[PDB]
Amino acid sequence: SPEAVYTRIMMNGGRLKRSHIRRYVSVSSNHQARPNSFAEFLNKTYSS
RNA sequence: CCACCAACCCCACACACCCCCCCACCCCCACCCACCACACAAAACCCCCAAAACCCCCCCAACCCCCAAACCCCACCAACCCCACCAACCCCACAAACC
């Protein structure tokens, strides 16, 4: 539900969960990231 | 570093479907005598003349030490980011855009 997601974001203080970051990096890293793509952004932003 | 409509297994004649099959067969077994890729005997350390045996030795000797003065592969001065044109800086920008 929209209400469920919103509360869950509020509970974590509007900050990404570590699992969210793990998922983003695993997708971005296992891809031939294009110059200004979303993959490149994900890779450059969350990598350590 | 999406896209022709549409269809969207690099599926589909039928019959079929072990890269099975002639039969006898079926150790890439078999003549016999054999059967250590053993063997003349004498004999077997790829041992031996003696004298010997550091691939030791003339002596002086014995740092691949030494003129002297010396001894940072220091030193003119000015210096001393292998900094510096300004304007200033994403190796950003027409617009429209952005599998």
From TrEMBL:
Location(s) in or outside the cell? Host cytoplasm; Virion
Bilayer-crossing regions: none
Concerning its family, UniProt says: Belongs to the lyssavirus nucleocapsid protein family.
Q: What is this protein called?
A: Nucleoprotein
Gene of this entry: N
